[PDB]
Design an enzyme around this catalytic site. Structure first.
Site, PDB file in Angstrom:
ATOM      1  CG  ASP A  95      -1.979  -1.142   1.223  1.00 18.30           C
ATOM      2  OD1 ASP A  95      -2.048  -1.905   0.231  1.00 18.30           O
ATOM      3  OD2 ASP A  95      -2.704  -1.265   2.231  1.00 18.30           O
ATOM      4  CB  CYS A 144      -0.167   2.448 -10.625  1.00 21.26           C
ATOM      5  SG  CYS A 144       0.498   4.109 -10.910  1.00 21.26           S
ATOM      6  CB  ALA A 176      -1.556   9.231 -10.093  1.00 26.85           C
ATOM      7  NE  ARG A 180       1.543   1.256  -5.915  1.00 27.75           N
ATOM      8  CZ  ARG A 180       0.574   0.608  -5.277  1.00 27.75           C
ATOM      9  NH1 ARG A 180      -0.090  -0.371  -5.875  1.00 27.75           N
ATOM     10  NH2 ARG A 180       0.274   0.926  -4.024  1.00 27.75           N
TER      11      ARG A 180
END
Length: 498
Positions: A389, A423, A425, A429
């Protein structure tokens, strides 16, 4: 532009003193740290207000404000929109005058403690290559070393007199950056007519891929190298007007994380009966394999996502997020259940088979246009589910195994379009995954003995999409992923030998 408003080596009390003595009402500065986060110190009515900015790897989340791709985009937004930033009560916070930092530690040309530097300019340097180092004989002073030729390394003394910098005559500058920028535009001329042109700084980040273990060891370093890369973001404030249109406002997951106009994926064959050419996505080209970096689907953008996959002839989807994370929506379900067929506007998607691994799920999807036969193609969805997370995974093994399978599928499909990577936005990632794939691909083709430059690659990808690679943790993870990939190839060669 500049990015002088960011002070890298400052404390809360030092920031308050600088705003109260060197600034006025409306003066602001950004500062790091509570490690991992950032603080926006602003002066209002003779008092200093501190606004917390947090980044877990997805976006810069300003407390009682908006989410942004970069700190430069955050500053540009509030300087242009005065009545947008407010306190918990509702009182407006104005970002009017940036407080400039004199510290040159985050500059590409600054080497601090090099000794009398000539060898580095001979081995690495070219015509117009320059560096700024601390003086050895007189403490406080600095030395500018510049290479010129097809031939010579010229040394220029920089004296520090009453907190001002000069070259022994002319103008006195408040900081080393102001001195460098002035002599870059207005060059120095030697006695015999040689022009001391400052065109590019000395590259100190490029390393041979086989020597990754030694560089990672020296950086364990990683913070100073990342902040230098972060200082370059002011040069990437490109146009994003299409995303700022009222027709496109609900098509963005985050109102401020927008695609660049020059790289955005333009949609065609849309419904004539508002705007039908927009999607929060960008074409990423390594300057072979191309990528489409995009946000997580919104229910009103699912039809546009499939329109993009079909138009761009994409056959591989890389999903690096769960649908829901920390009870918050990150990406909606744009794919149907296993064995089911679903229509998404003019597009039709069939879920053929779902293959589950420990770190990911492979979904064999069949994309086609409704009303047309012989338009069907297989689109392979790789859904990474084990990414934490907050932060990055402790071991890069799972990410590398996943990317190696993603690469092998793309290579096996003839006439395949760019790899869709997303991912939440589509910057943190997504940026991390694309950069790791680009760097590993250089080693795939050229072998273990090849040149790789981690910040140069990130800067190139950042010019194609706002703030690709969000945190220092992600930056460290890119190095550790390359190191693990080099290690695995080294062992495989030794396995064949022994």
């Amino acid at each position: 532009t500049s990015r002088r408003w960011f002070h890298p080596n400052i404390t809360g009390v030092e920031a308050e003193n600088l705003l109260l003595t060197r600034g006025v009402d409306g003066s602001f500065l950004a500062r790091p740290s509570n490690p991992g986060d950032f603080t926006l110190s602003v002066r209002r009515n003779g008092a200093v207000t501190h606004i917390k900015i947090q980044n877990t790897g997805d976006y810069y989340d300003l407390y009682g404000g908006e989410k942004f791709a970069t700190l430069a985009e955050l500053v540009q937004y509030y300087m242009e929109h005065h009545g947008q930033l407010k306190e918990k009560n509702g009182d407006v916070i104005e970002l009017k005058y940036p407080l400039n930092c004199a510290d040159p530690t985050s500059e590409r040309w600054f080497h601090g403690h090099l000794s009398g530097a000539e060898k580095l300019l001979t081995e690495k340097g070219k015509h117009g290559s320059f560096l700024v180092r601390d003086s050895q004989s007189h403490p406080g002073d600095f030395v500018l070393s510049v290479r010129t030729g097809d031939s010579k390394v010229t040394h220029v003394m920089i004296r520090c007199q009453e907190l001002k910098y000069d070259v022994g005559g002319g103008e006195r500058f408040d900081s080393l950056t102001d001195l460098v920028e002035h002599y870059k535009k207005n060059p120095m001329v030697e006695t015999l007519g040689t022009v001391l042109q400052l065109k590019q700084p000395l590259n100190t980040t490029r390393i041979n891929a086989a020597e990754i273990e030694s560089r990672v060891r020296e950086l364990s370093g990683f913070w100073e190298e990342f902040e230098t890369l972060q200082q370059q973001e002011c040069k990437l404030l490109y146009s994003r007007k299409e995303g700022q249109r009222q027709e496109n406002k609900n098509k963005n997951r985050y109102k401020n994380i927008l695609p660049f106009d020059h790289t955005r994926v333009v949609l065609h064959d849309g419904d004539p009966n508002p705007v039908s050419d927009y999607i929060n996505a960008n074409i990423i080209m390594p300057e072979k394999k191309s990528y489409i970096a995009t946000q997580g689907c919104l229910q009103n953008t699912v039809n546009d996502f499939w329109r993009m996959v079909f138009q761009e002839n994409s056959r591989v989807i890389v999903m690096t997020t769960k649908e829901v994370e920390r009870g918050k929506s990150k990406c909606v379900k744009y794919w149907p259940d296993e064995y089911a067929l679903k229509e998404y506007g003019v597009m039709r998607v069939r879920n053929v088979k779902e293959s589950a691994a420990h770190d990911y799920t492979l979904r064999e999807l069949k994309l086609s246009k409704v009303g047309q036969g012989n338009t069907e193609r297989t689109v392979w969805q790789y859904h990474f589910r084990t990414w934490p997370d907050h932060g990055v995974p402790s071991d890069p093994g799972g990410v590398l195994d996943f990317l190696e399978e993603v690469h092998h599928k793309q290579e096996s499909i003839m006439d395949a379009g760019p790899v869709v990577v997303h991912c939440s936005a589509g910057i943190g990632r997504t940026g991390t995954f694309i950069v790791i794939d680009i760097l590993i691909d250089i080693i795939r083709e050229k072998g273990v003995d090849c040149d790789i430059d981690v910040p140069k690659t990130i800067q190139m990808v950042r010019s194609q999409r706002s703030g690709m690679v969000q945190t220092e943790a992600q930056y460290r993870f890119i190095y550790m992923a390359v190191q693990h990939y080099i290690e695995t190839l080294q062992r495989r060669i030794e396995e064949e030998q022994k």
